[PDB]
Design a protein around this nucleic acid. Structure first.
Length: 184
RNA sequence: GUUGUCCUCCCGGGCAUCGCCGGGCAGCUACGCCGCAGCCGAUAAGGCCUGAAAGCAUCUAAGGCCGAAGCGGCCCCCGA
């Protein structure tokens, strides 16, 4: 099990992303927008030491080392968030009634969900943009977290739990996440 | 309207503890009429995102998104 005792990690940043700290809060600014996050752990200093952002605490514990690596991964997703967007594709597939998925406002509305005269809805955050092209639907946007939430909110609304789950199966599902979610 | 009886008595009255019966206004009542929301925020159970401990995976270990007739505002009653 991990041989740390400093504990100190180092996070590699290019010259194409600059990062500036002011307290225990990290802001990452690159070509395409910027994104700020708050990393909230107590007793840990996050600071920029030259070209590298370093996350450290003097007293190592098993719990602190997990938190340090999670924060380090968050900066990396932010880095590849501020260079280029993340794309998840979802497909709408249906059991009987053609099903019309359009974005009206800052919510996606789905109508003709099993012949329904009522909406199913899922929230679409401003950092994420949702475009519908036929019955492929693409959730796209700056940050991996924003993109992950927006896409998943769409699947859960349409989610079948009200009847049989092997025979009633109409709804829009996560065809791409970055593999094929999710099985046992 | 009407029985008995009293006033001589038509008229007009007493009493039988409203004499009894018939109608019914005001007023009071139902066996009458009229009125008595939504939404939101924060949460449960739950569904999940990112994501480690365990380079992967994972709804949780931190961060984050929703979500109860229940909880508050909203609402009704009292209140120098």
């Amino acid at each position: 099990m991990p041989v740390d005792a400093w504990i100190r990690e180092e996070v590699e940043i290019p010259e194409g992303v600059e990062v500036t700290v002011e307290g225990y809060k990290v802001k990452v600014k690159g070509p395409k927008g910027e994104l700020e996050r708050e990393f909230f752990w107590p007793g840990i200093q996050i600071f920029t030491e030259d070209g590298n952002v370093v996350i450290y605490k003097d007293f190592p514990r098993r719990k602190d080392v997990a938190i340090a690596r999670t924060f380090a991964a968050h900066i990396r997703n932010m880095i590849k968030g501020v260079t280029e967007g993340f794309t998840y594709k979802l497909k709408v597939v249906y059991s009987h009634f053609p099903i019309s998925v359009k974005v009206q406002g800052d919510e996606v509305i789905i109508e003709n969900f099993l012949g329904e005269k009522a909406p199913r809805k899922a929230k679409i955050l401003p950092g994420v943009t949702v475009k519908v092209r036929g019955q492929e639907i693409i959730v796209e946007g700056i940050d991996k977290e924003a993109v992950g939430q927006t896409a998943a909110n769409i699947e859960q609304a349409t989610r079948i739990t009200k009847w049989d789950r092997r025979i009633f199966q109409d709804g829009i599902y996560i065809v791409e996440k970055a593999g094929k979610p999710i099985t046992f």
